Amino acid sequence: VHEFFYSLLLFDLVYREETLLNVIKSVTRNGRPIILTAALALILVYLFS
Amino acid sequence: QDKEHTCETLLMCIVTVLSHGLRSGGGVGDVLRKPSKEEPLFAARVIYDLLFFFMVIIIVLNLIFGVIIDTFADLRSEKQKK
Amino acid sequence: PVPSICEFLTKESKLRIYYTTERDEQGSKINDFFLRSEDLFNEMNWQKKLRAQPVLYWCARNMSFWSSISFNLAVLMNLLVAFFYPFKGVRGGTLEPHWLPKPHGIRALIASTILRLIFSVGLQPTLFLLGAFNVCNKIIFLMSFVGNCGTFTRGYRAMVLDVEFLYHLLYLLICAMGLFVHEFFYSLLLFDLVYREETLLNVIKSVTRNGRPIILTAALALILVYLFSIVGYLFFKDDFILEVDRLPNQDKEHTCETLLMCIVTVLSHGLRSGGGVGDVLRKPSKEEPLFAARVIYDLLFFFMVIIIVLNLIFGVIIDTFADLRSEKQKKEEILKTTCFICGLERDKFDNKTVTFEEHIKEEHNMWHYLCFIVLVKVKD
Ligand SMILES: [Ca+2]
Ligand SMILES: [Ca+2]
Ligand SMILES: [Ca+2]
Ligand SMILES: [Ca+2]
Ligand SMILES: [Zn+2]
């Protein structure tokens, strides 16, 4: 189809690498705290607007 | 280059604040027009800018980053123990 | 034999008593556990009394339903206010078409009815109807809450003293004013998300647990900017030229004429700018007699304030947010691997006769101790 589809193949680096998976698990392990904090930021900017 | 009004609708006003004030490093007071010291609402503008900066930029984003740091230390602690 | 009244505990109260009991400076949970015995007895009495009312019991048996309905309706009306305000002017759609789980189907049907109502009758009537329904659901929830808690038998001093009841009354008042005064009052209802959510409360406690360090650091930053503004007023009076624009009934303007305005300029522009105060002051030439003074002033402001004080506030926040995790881990680990009553450790039961698991549910079960206390209290 298009040569640009080879860009998605870089995501295999996370699968192949063990340390990068841990660095990602840093943000995905407590992702609910982060989602809730983002919602709180949305509430604050809504009030300020 | 011509200026344009953006807070005519509440949705556009929210979009302006959330897309410019949040991304700017100095808060929302940098995208709004800067007032003179003779305005009746100069103090109100100063207080609004400072409150936005302190509550959002200083606190909430740093709080997200602190969450990330604490999790990234919790993983190391449990891995060391295991 | 366990008393007959002991069967009137909800699981929620049991979990709360198991989790929220604190060790004393002795290292024992016995005193705090005993201090809640009379409260547990009184609420068992109220639970037994609630049997005779078949409708109040049904209403008080559905906290989750009323709370979830109220929260969902609040967020729905808040998005509807945000996206379509002001409601002056309606644009129709009508394109070439248009536009197993039971709870998902119910939510989808409710959303379909809501969208048909908003596209059929209008915006303001829909908002009014939604606000009225929210007020009705809130009063139902309030009746359910007061029925389940049952503290109204203690007199109106109990209503005044507690805070959850007061919080719900302010919630209801805000809903009523949003229905009657202005639609913008529904924005305050988003603060119930912090109340409903457990993790967000901990993330807030990160900053509120040592808030005095942060207040003191902010005061120190104010002192530093005050000193820097004094120095600037003394030596760099004519460099405080800022850009302004006058609205009709871009020209520069002097701002450090008064010490108050000079402080305001420094504190509102230098502190917010990422490069210090040297970016809002007029930039000098290399032939000026005070070029080195300006460079030193800019660098000192940057290094002392931007690099140090703000990062120090953030470090305070990080350290508190790690302290909470440390103490929670310690408390939960003590909870898991130690008998509630005698306080013995798990390793004492490694291979002797009976294991720890049956020890903490047959011979030192705390619920049996509570039953014995109730029996002694109720038996003649
Ligand atoms: Ca920007
Ligand atoms: Ca950040
Ligand atoms: Ca600025
Ligand atoms: Ca910072
Ligand atoms: Zn025992």
Coordinates of C-alpha atoms and ligand atoms in Angstrom, one line a residue:
Chain A
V1 CA 0.0 0.0 0.0
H2 CA 2.5 2.6 1.2
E3 CA 6.1 2.7 2.4
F4 CA 4.9 4.8 5.4
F5 CA 3.5 1.6 7.0
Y6 CA 7.0 0.5 8.0
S7 CA 7.0 3.2 10.7
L8 CA 4.7 1.1 12.9
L9 CA 7.3 -1.7 12.9
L10 CA 9.4 0.4 15.4
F11 CA 7.0 -0.6 18.2
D12 CA 8.6 -4.0 18.2
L13 CA 11.5 -2.4 20.0
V14 CA 9.5 -2.3 23.2
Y15 CA 8.6 -5.9 22.8
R16 CA 12.2 -7.0 22.2
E17 CA 13.7 -4.9 25.0
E18 CA 13.3 -5.8 28.7
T19 CA 14.4 -2.5 30.3
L20 CA 12.2 -0.4 28.1
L21 CA 9.2 -2.5 29.2
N22 CA 10.0 -1.7 32.8
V23 CA 10.3 2.0 32.0
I24 CA 6.9 1.9 30.3
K25 CA 5.5 0.0 33.3
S26 CA 6.6 3.0 35.4
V27 CA 3.7 5.0 33.8
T28 CA 1.3 2.1 33.2
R29 CA 1.4 0.6 36.7
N30 CA -0.5 3.4 38.4
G31 CA -2.1 4.9 35.3
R32 CA -5.3 5.4 37.1
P33 CA -3.7 8.1 39.4
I34 CA -2.5 9.8 36.3
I35 CA -5.9 9.7 34.6
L36 CA -7.6 11.1 37.7
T37 CA -5.0 13.9 37.9
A38 CA -5.6 14.7 34.3
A39 CA -9.3 14.9 34.9
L40 CA -8.6 17.2 37.9
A41 CA -6.6 19.4 35.6
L42 CA -9.5 19.5 33.1
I43 CA -11.8 20.5 35.9
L44 CA -9.5 23.3 37.0
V45 CA -9.1 24.7 33.5
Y46 CA -12.9 24.5 33.0
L47 CA -13.4 26.6 36.1
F48 CA -10.8 29.1 35.1
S49 CA -12.3 29.4 31.6
Chain B
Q1 CA -1.4 39.0 10.7
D2 CA -4.7 40.1 12.2
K3 CA -6.0 39.5 15.7
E4 CA -9.2 37.6 16.4
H5 CA -11.6 37.1 19.3
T6 CA -11.8 33.6 20.7
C7 CA -13.9 33.6 23.9
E8 CA -17.2 34.4 22.1
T9 CA -18.4 30.9 22.7
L10 CA -17.7 29.0 26.0
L11 CA -16.4 26.0 24.0
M12 CA -13.9 28.2 22.1
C13 CA -12.9 30.0 25.3
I14 CA -12.2 26.6 27.0
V15 CA -10.2 25.5 24.0
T16 CA -8.1 28.7 24.0
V17 CA -7.3 28.4 27.7
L18 CA -6.6 24.6 27.6
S19 CA -4.5 24.7 24.4
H20 CA -2.5 27.9 25.0
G21 CA -2.4 28.5 28.8
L22 CA -1.6 24.9 29.6
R23 CA 1.1 24.6 27.0
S24 CA 2.7 28.0 27.7
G25 CA 5.3 27.8 30.5
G26 CA 4.1 31.0 32.1
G27 CA 0.4 30.2 32.5
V28 CA -2.6 31.8 30.7
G29 CA -1.5 35.3 31.3
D30 CA 0.9 35.3 28.3
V31 CA -1.8 34.7 25.6
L32 CA -4.3 37.2 27.0
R33 CA -3.8 40.8 26.0
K34 CA -1.5 42.6 28.5
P35 CA -3.3 45.4 30.4
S36 CA -2.1 48.8 31.4
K37 CA -1.7 49.9 35.1
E38 CA -4.5 52.4 34.7
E39 CA -7.2 49.7 34.1
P40 CA -9.9 49.2 36.7
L41 CA -9.3 45.4 36.5
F42 CA -5.5 45.4 36.6
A43 CA -5.3 43.8 40.0
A44 CA -8.0 41.3 39.0
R45 CA -5.9 40.3 36.0
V46 CA -2.8 39.9 38.1
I47 CA -4.5 37.8 40.7
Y48 CA -6.1 35.6 38.0
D49 CA -2.8 35.1 36.2
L50 CA -1.0 34.2 39.5
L51 CA -3.7 31.9 40.7
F52 CA -3.8 30.0 37.4
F53 CA 0.0 29.7 37.4
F54 CA 0.3 28.5 41.0
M55 CA -2.6 26.1 41.0
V56 CA -2.1 24.5 37.6
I57 CA 1.4 24.8 36.3
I58 CA 3.3 24.6 39.6
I59 CA 1.0 22.0 41.3
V60 CA -0.9 19.7 39.0
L61 CA 1.8 19.0 36.4
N62 CA 4.4 18.5 39.1
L63 CA 1.9 16.2 40.8
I64 CA 1.6 14.0 37.7
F65 CA 5.4 13.9 37.5
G66 CA 5.7 13.0 41.2
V67 CA 3.2 10.2 40.7
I68 CA 5.4 8.9 37.9
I69 CA 8.5 9.1 40.0
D70 CA 7.0 7.3 43.0
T71 CA 5.8 4.4 40.8
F72 CA 9.2 4.2 39.1
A73 CA 10.7 3.9 42.6
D74 CA 8.1 1.4 43.8
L75 CA 9.0 -1.0 40.9
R76 CA 12.7 -0.9 41.9
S77 CA 11.9 -1.5 45.6
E78 CA 9.7 -4.5 44.9
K79 CA 12.2 -5.9 42.3
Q80 CA 15.1 -5.6 44.8
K81 CA 13.0 -7.3 47.5
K82 CA 12.0 -10.2 45.2
Chain C
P1 CA -23.2 -18.8 71.7
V2 CA -23.1 -15.6 69.6
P3 CA -26.0 -13.2 70.4
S4 CA -28.9 -12.9 67.9
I5 CA -28.2 -9.2 67.3
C6 CA -24.7 -9.8 66.0
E7 CA -26.1 -10.9 62.6
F8 CA -26.9 -7.3 61.8
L9 CA -23.5 -6.1 60.6
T10 CA -23.0 -5.1 57.0
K11 CA -19.8 -6.1 55.4
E12 CA -18.8 -2.5 54.9
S13 CA -18.6 -1.8 58.6
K14 CA -16.6 -5.0 59.2
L15 CA -14.0 -3.9 56.5
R16 CA -13.9 -0.4 57.9
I17 CA -13.2 -1.7 61.4
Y18 CA -10.6 -4.1 60.1
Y19 CA -8.7 -1.4 58.1
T20 CA -9.1 1.9 59.9
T21 CA -7.9 0.7 63.4
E22 CA -4.6 2.3 64.3
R23 CA -1.8 0.9 66.5
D24 CA -1.0 3.0 69.5
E25 CA 2.4 4.0 70.8
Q26 CA 2.4 0.7 72.6
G27 CA 2.2 -1.2 69.3
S28 CA -1.3 -2.7 70.0
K29 CA -4.6 -2.4 68.2
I30 CA -6.7 -3.4 71.3
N31 CA -7.5 0.1 72.7
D32 CA -8.7 1.6 69.4
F33 CA -10.6 -1.6 68.5
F34 CA -12.4 -1.4 71.9
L35 CA -13.2 2.3 71.5
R36 CA -15.5 1.5 68.5
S37 CA -17.4 -1.3 70.2
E38 CA -20.2 1.0 71.5
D39 CA -20.6 2.6 68.1
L40 CA -20.8 -0.9 66.5
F41 CA -23.4 -1.9 69.1
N42 CA -25.5 1.2 68.5
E43 CA -25.4 0.7 64.7
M44 CA -26.4 -2.9 65.1
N45 CA -29.4 -1.7 67.1
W46 CA -30.3 0.7 64.3
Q47 CA -29.9 -2.1 61.7
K48 CA -32.3 -4.3 63.6
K49 CA -34.7 -1.4 64.0
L50 CA -34.6 -0.9 60.2
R51 CA -36.3 -4.3 59.7
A52 CA -39.7 -3.0 60.5
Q53 CA -39.6 -0.4 57.7
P54 CA -39.7 -2.2 54.3
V55 CA -39.5 1.0 52.2
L56 CA -36.8 2.9 54.1
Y57 CA -34.7 -0.3 54.2
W58 CA -35.1 -0.6 50.4
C59 CA -34.1 3.0 49.9
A60 CA -31.1 2.7 52.2
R61 CA -30.0 -0.5 50.5
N62 CA -29.1 1.3 47.3
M63 CA -26.3 3.8 48.1
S64 CA -24.3 2.8 45.1
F65 CA -27.2 3.2 42.7
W66 CA -28.2 6.7 43.8
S67 CA -24.6 7.9 44.1
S68 CA -23.7 6.6 40.6
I69 CA -26.8 8.1 39.0
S70 CA -26.1 11.5 40.6
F71 CA -22.5 11.5 39.5
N72 CA -23.3 10.5 35.9
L73 CA -26.1 13.0 35.6
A74 CA -23.8 15.8 37.0
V75 CA -21.0 15.1 34.5
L76 CA -23.5 14.8 31.7
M77 CA -25.1 18.1 32.4
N78 CA -21.7 19.7 32.8
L79 CA -20.5 18.5 29.4
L80 CA -23.8 19.7 27.9
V81 CA -23.3 23.1 29.4
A82 CA -19.7 23.3 28.3
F83 CA -20.3 22.3 24.6
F84 CA -23.5 24.2 23.9
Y85 CA -23.3 27.5 25.8
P86 CA -24.9 29.9 25.2
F87 CA -28.1 28.0 24.1
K88 CA -29.1 30.8 21.8
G89 CA -29.4 29.3 18.3
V90 CA -30.1 25.6 17.4
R91 CA -28.7 24.0 14.2
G92 CA -30.5 20.8 13.1
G93 CA -28.9 17.6 11.8
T94 CA -30.9 15.2 9.6
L95 CA -28.1 14.0 7.3
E96 CA -28.6 11.3 4.7
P97 CA -29.3 9.1 7.8
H98 CA -29.1 10.8 11.2
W99 CA -26.5 12.2 13.6
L100 CA -25.7 -9.3 26.7
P101 CA -24.5 -6.7 29.2
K102 CA -27.6 -5.2 30.9
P103 CA -26.1 -2.0 32.4
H104 CA -24.5 -1.0 29.0
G105 CA -27.9 -1.5 27.3
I106 CA -29.7 0.6 29.9
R107 CA -27.1 3.4 29.6
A108 CA -27.4 3.3 25.8
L109 CA -31.2 3.5 26.0
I110 CA -31.0 6.4 28.4
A111 CA -28.5 8.2 26.1
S112 CA -30.8 7.6 23.1
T113 CA -33.8 9.0 25.0
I114 CA -31.7 12.0 26.2
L115 CA -30.5 12.8 22.6
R116 CA -34.0 12.5 21.2
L117 CA -35.3 14.8 23.9
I118 CA -32.6 17.4 23.3
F119 CA -33.1 17.2 19.5
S120 CA -36.9 17.4 19.8
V121 CA -37.9 19.9 22.5
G122 CA -34.8 22.0 22.9
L123 CA -31.8 22.9 25.1
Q124 CA -33.1 25.0 28.0
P125 CA -36.1 22.7 28.7
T126 CA -33.8 19.7 28.6
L127 CA -31.4 21.3 31.0
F128 CA -34.3 22.3 33.4
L129 CA -35.7 18.7 33.3
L130 CA -32.2 17.2 34.0
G131 CA -31.6 19.6 36.9
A132 CA -35.0 18.8 38.4
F133 CA -34.4 15.1 38.1
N134 CA -30.9 15.5 39.6
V135 CA -32.4 17.4 42.6
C136 CA -35.0 14.6 43.0
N137 CA -32.3 11.9 43.0
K138 CA -30.2 14.0 45.4
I139 CA -33.1 14.2 47.9
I140 CA -33.7 10.5 47.5
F141 CA -30.0 9.8 48.2
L142 CA -30.0 12.2 51.2
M143 CA -33.0 10.3 52.7
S144 CA -31.3 7.0 52.1
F145 CA -28.1 8.3 53.7
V146 CA -29.8 9.6 56.8
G147 CA -31.8 6.4 57.1
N148 CA -28.8 4.1 56.9
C149 CA -26.6 6.2 59.2
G150 CA -29.4 6.5 61.7
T151 CA -27.7 9.2 63.6
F152 CA -30.8 11.5 63.6
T153 CA -32.0 9.7 66.7
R154 CA -29.1 11.3 68.6
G155 CA -30.6 14.8 68.2
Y156 CA -29.8 17.7 65.9
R157 CA -26.4 18.2 67.5
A158 CA -25.3 15.1 65.6
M159 CA -26.5 16.6 62.4
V160 CA -24.6 19.8 63.1
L161 CA -21.4 18.1 64.3
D162 CA -20.8 15.7 61.4
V163 CA -19.6 16.9 58.0
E164 CA -20.8 14.3 55.5
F165 CA -24.4 15.3 56.0
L166 CA -23.3 19.0 55.7
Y167 CA -21.4 18.2 52.5
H168 CA -24.5 16.6 51.0
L169 CA -26.6 19.6 52.0
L170 CA -24.2 22.0 50.2
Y171 CA -24.3 19.6 47.2
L172 CA -28.1 19.8 47.1
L173 CA -28.0 23.6 47.6
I174 CA -25.6 24.0 44.7
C175 CA -27.8 21.7 42.5
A176 CA -30.8 23.8 43.4
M177 CA -29.1 27.1 42.6
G178 CA -27.8 25.6 39.3
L179 CA -31.4 24.8 38.4
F180 CA -32.8 28.2 39.5
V181 CA -30.1 30.8 39.2
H182 CA -27.5 30.0 36.5
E183 CA -26.4 26.9 34.7
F184 CA -22.8 27.7 35.5
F185 CA -23.3 26.4 39.1
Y186 CA -23.2 22.8 37.9
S187 CA -19.4 23.3 37.5
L188 CA -18.9 23.1 41.3
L189 CA -20.4 19.6 41.3
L190 CA -17.2 18.2 39.7
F191 CA -15.5 18.5 43.2
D192 CA -17.5 15.4 44.2
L193 CA -15.0 13.4 42.1
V194 CA -12.4 13.8 44.8
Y195 CA -14.9 12.7 47.4
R196 CA -15.9 9.6 45.4
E197 CA -12.4 8.6 44.4
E198 CA -10.0 7.0 46.9
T199 CA -6.7 7.3 44.9
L200 CA -7.3 11.0 44.0
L201 CA -7.7 11.7 47.7
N202 CA -4.2 10.2 48.4
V203 CA -2.7 12.2 45.5
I204 CA -4.2 15.3 47.1
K205 CA -2.9 14.2 50.6
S206 CA 0.5 14.3 48.9
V207 CA 0.4 18.1 48.9
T208 CA -1.9 18.6 51.9
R209 CA 0.1 16.4 54.4
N210 CA 3.1 18.8 54.7
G211 CA 1.4 21.9 53.4
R212 CA 3.2 24.0 56.1
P213 CA 6.6 23.3 54.4
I214 CA 5.1 24.5 51.1
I215 CA 3.6 27.6 52.7
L216 CA 6.9 28.5 54.3
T217 CA 8.8 28.0 51.1
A218 CA 6.3 30.2 49.3
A219 CA 6.9 32.9 52.0
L220 CA 10.6 32.5 51.4
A221 CA 10.1 33.0 47.7
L222 CA 8.1 36.2 48.4
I223 CA 10.9 37.4 50.6
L224 CA 13.5 36.8 47.8
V225 CA 11.4 38.5 45.2
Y226 CA 10.8 41.4 47.6
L227 CA 14.6 41.9 48.0
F228 CA 15.2 41.6 44.3
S229 CA 12.5 44.2 43.6
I230 CA 14.1 46.5 46.2
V231 CA 17.5 46.2 44.5
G232 CA 16.0 46.8 41.0
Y233 CA 14.1 49.9 42.2
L234 CA 17.4 51.2 43.7
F235 CA 19.7 50.6 40.8
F236 CA 17.7 49.7 37.7
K237 CA 14.8 52.1 37.9
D238 CA 14.8 53.0 34.2
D239 CA 15.0 49.4 32.9
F240 CA 11.5 48.4 34.0
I241 CA 9.9 49.3 30.7
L242 CA 7.2 46.8 29.8
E243 CA 5.0 46.5 26.7
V244 CA 1.3 47.2 26.9
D245 CA -1.6 47.8 24.5
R246 CA -4.4 50.3 25.1
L247 CA -7.9 49.2 24.2
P248 CA -9.8 51.8 22.1
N249 CA -11.9 54.3 24.0
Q250 CA 1.3 48.9 21.2
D251 CA 3.1 51.4 23.4
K252 CA 5.7 50.9 26.2
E253 CA 5.1 52.0 29.8
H254 CA 7.1 52.5 32.9
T255 CA 6.2 50.2 35.8
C256 CA 8.8 50.6 38.6
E257 CA 7.7 54.2 39.5
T258 CA 6.1 52.9 42.7
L259 CA 7.7 50.2 44.8
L260 CA 4.4 48.3 44.9
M261 CA 4.1 48.3 41.1
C262 CA 7.8 47.3 40.8
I263 CA 7.3 44.3 43.1
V264 CA 4.1 43.4 41.2
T265 CA 6.0 43.5 37.9
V266 CA 8.9 41.4 39.2
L267 CA 6.6 38.8 40.9
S268 CA 4.1 38.5 38.1
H269 CA 6.5 38.5 35.1
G270 CA 9.9 37.3 36.4
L271 CA 8.5 34.5 38.4
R272 CA 6.2 33.2 35.6
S273 CA 8.8 33.6 32.9
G274 CA 11.0 30.5 32.5
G275 CA 14.2 32.5 32.1
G276 CA 13.9 34.8 35.2
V277 CA 13.3 38.5 35.3
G278 CA 15.9 39.4 32.7
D279 CA 13.5 38.7 29.9
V280 CA 10.9 41.3 30.8
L281 CA 13.5 44.1 31.5
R282 CA 14.8 46.0 28.5
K283 CA 17.9 44.3 27.1
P284 CA 21.0 46.5 27.4
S285 CA 23.9 47.1 25.0
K286 CA 27.5 45.9 25.7
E287 CA 28.6 49.6 25.9
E288 CA 26.5 50.4 29.0
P289 CA 28.3 51.2 32.2
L290 CA 26.0 48.7 34.0
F291 CA 26.0 45.8 31.6
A292 CA 27.9 43.6 34.0
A293 CA 25.6 44.6 36.8
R294 CA 22.6 43.6 34.7
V295 CA 24.1 40.3 33.8
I296 CA 24.9 39.5 37.4
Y297 CA 21.5 40.5 38.6
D298 CA 19.8 38.3 36.0
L299 CA 21.9 35.3 36.7
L300 CA 21.5 35.7 40.5
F301 CA 17.7 36.0 40.2
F302 CA 17.6 32.9 37.9
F303 CA 19.8 30.7 40.1
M304 CA 18.4 31.6 43.5
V305 CA 14.7 31.6 42.6
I306 CA 13.9 29.7 39.4
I307 CA 16.5 26.9 39.9
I308 CA 16.4 26.6 43.6
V309 CA 13.1 27.6 45.3
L310 CA 10.6 26.2 42.8
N311 CA 12.5 22.9 42.6
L312 CA 12.6 22.9 46.4
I313 CA 8.8 23.1 46.5
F314 CA 8.6 20.3 44.1
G315 CA 11.1 18.2 46.1
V316 CA 9.0 18.8 49.2
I317 CA 6.0 17.4 47.3
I318 CA 7.9 14.4 46.0
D319 CA 9.2 13.5 49.4
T320 CA 5.8 13.7 51.0
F321 CA 4.3 11.6 48.2
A322 CA 7.0 8.9 48.9
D323 CA 6.4 9.1 52.7
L324 CA 2.8 8.3 52.2
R325 CA 3.7 5.2 50.2
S326 CA 6.3 4.1 52.7
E327 CA 3.9 4.3 55.7
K328 CA 1.1 2.6 53.8
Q329 CA 3.3 -0.3 52.8
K330 CA 4.5 -0.7 56.4
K331 CA 0.9 -0.5 57.8
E332 CA -0.4 -3.0 55.2
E333 CA 2.5 -5.4 55.8
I334 CA 1.9 -5.4 59.6
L335 CA -1.8 -6.0 58.8
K336 CA -1.2 -9.0 56.6
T337 CA 1.5 -10.9 58.7
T338 CA 0.4 -10.4 62.3
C339 CA -2.5 -11.6 64.5
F340 CA -4.9 -8.7 65.1
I341 CA -5.4 -9.5 68.8
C342 CA -2.3 -11.0 70.3
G343 CA 0.1 -9.4 67.9
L344 CA 2.2 -12.5 67.3
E345 CA 4.1 -12.8 64.1
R346 CA 3.5 -15.4 61.4
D347 CA 6.8 -17.2 61.7
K348 CA 5.9 -18.4 65.2
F349 CA 3.4 -20.8 63.6
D350 CA 5.9 -22.3 61.2
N351 CA 5.4 -26.0 62.0
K352 CA 3.8 -26.1 65.5
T353 CA 0.4 -27.9 65.7
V354 CA -2.0 -25.3 64.3
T355 CA -1.1 -22.9 61.5
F356 CA -1.4 -19.1 61.5
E357 CA -4.4 -19.2 59.1
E358 CA -6.7 -21.1 61.5
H359 CA -5.2 -19.3 64.4
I360 CA -6.5 -15.9 63.1
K361 CA -9.9 -17.3 62.4
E362 CA -10.7 -19.8 65.2
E363 CA -8.9 -18.8 68.4
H364 CA -8.1 -15.1 68.0
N365 CA -10.9 -14.0 65.6
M366 CA -11.7 -10.4 66.5
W367 CA -15.3 -10.8 65.5
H368 CA -15.7 -13.4 68.2
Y369 CA -14.3 -10.9 70.7
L370 CA -16.8 -8.3 69.5
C371 CA -19.6 -10.9 69.9
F372 CA -18.4 -11.6 73.4
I373 CA -18.4 -7.9 74.3
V374 CA -21.9 -7.5 72.9
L375 CA -23.1 -10.6 74.8
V376 CA -21.7 -9.3 78.1
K377 CA -23.3 -5.9 77.4
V378 CA -26.8 -7.4 76.5
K379 CA -26.9 -10.3 79.0
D380 CA -28.3 -9.7 82.5
Ligands
CA1 CA 1.7 28.6 23.5
CA2 CA 5.6 18.2 34.5
CA3 CA 5.6 36.4 31.3
CA4 CA 8.5 23.6 39.9
ZN5 ZN -3.7 -14.5 68.0

